Write a protein that binds this ligand. Sequence first.
Ligand code: LBV
Length: 319
Amino acid sequence: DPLPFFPPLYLGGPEITTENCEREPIHIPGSIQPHGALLTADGHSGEVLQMSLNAATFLGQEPTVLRGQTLAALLPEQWPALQAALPPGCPDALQYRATLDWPAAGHLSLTVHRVGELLILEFEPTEAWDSTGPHALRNAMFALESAPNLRALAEVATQTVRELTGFDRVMLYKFAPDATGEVIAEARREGLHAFLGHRFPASDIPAQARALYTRHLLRLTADTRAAAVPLDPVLNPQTNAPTPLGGAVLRATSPMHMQYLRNMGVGSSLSVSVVVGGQLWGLIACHHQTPYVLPPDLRTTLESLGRLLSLQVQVKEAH
Ligand SMILES: *C/C=C1/C(=C/c2[nH]c(/C=C3[NH+]=C(/C=C4\NC(=O)C(C=C)=C4C)C(C)=C\3CCC(=O)O)c(CCC(=O)O)c2C)NC(=O)[C@H]1C
């Protein structure tokens, strides 16, 4: 049961320290990571309500010009499909995805979800060869299925994720009932220090983070030195309140966790929740030595793999 959050910084809330970090409102940072752009829109009208300040870089026009325009006008070939895909009251983890063309090389990937009456739209560049087929997941299921026991399953799962991603380090991090954790499997680049078998305090993944990760199963930091980009306006006009960004991979990472990653020499981080019978069982935790943007289709493959692994774990634990 997490503590109530304090207000975010931009609402005059306290600075976050090691004494109060379980109260950081990590779901409402009012900012995004700079490798993409984000807009929010009214769920009925499609009016664009908030835009990240870097929106021009990705969309080819200025935030001051795009705000107030409707998605019906801006995205005529996707707006109807988006609407149909994310009806009022759908789960906030449900996503609509489309690939758009843009002046630059490759394409823009569009990912949308719905929170309350708001649509949250993420745009990130993707290269054409950065497609991953359903084969990646399909062929991977084979070695997961043949694993004879839980620890073998964990070992194959980390190796498979490393093969799919090329990450320098992939761990299966399992939580204990006291919320401490243990690295129970690890696939890593030759020469990297092993974390295998190491245990970590509960505070390293605080309670509000673990709660969030129970609902929104994938998060990342593409560049652990990159400054966040504000949303403008920072509050949702629908509510005059902060915008929930837990469902957006572009959400700005807690600065506290960014420092933790830099202290470990990590350039890029990504993890996927393993949720068993609705409780957070563990994470597939990935590091890269340098900044790296795992493509959207591969992220989705990894989420799917976490769900598959959840079930395989749940099968084996019953035995
Ligand atoms: C006082 C606050 C603290 C801080 C908070 C914090 N931690 C996270 C998220 C993560 N922490 C992780 C921990 C590990 N990564 C590892 O490699 C290992 C061991 C080898 C551990 C124990 C992980 C995996 C995450 C998840 C995100 C990720 O995969 O990179 C958050 C939430 C970040 C966010 O989603 O915005 C917060 C606020 N950790 C502390 O140590 C204290 C200082």
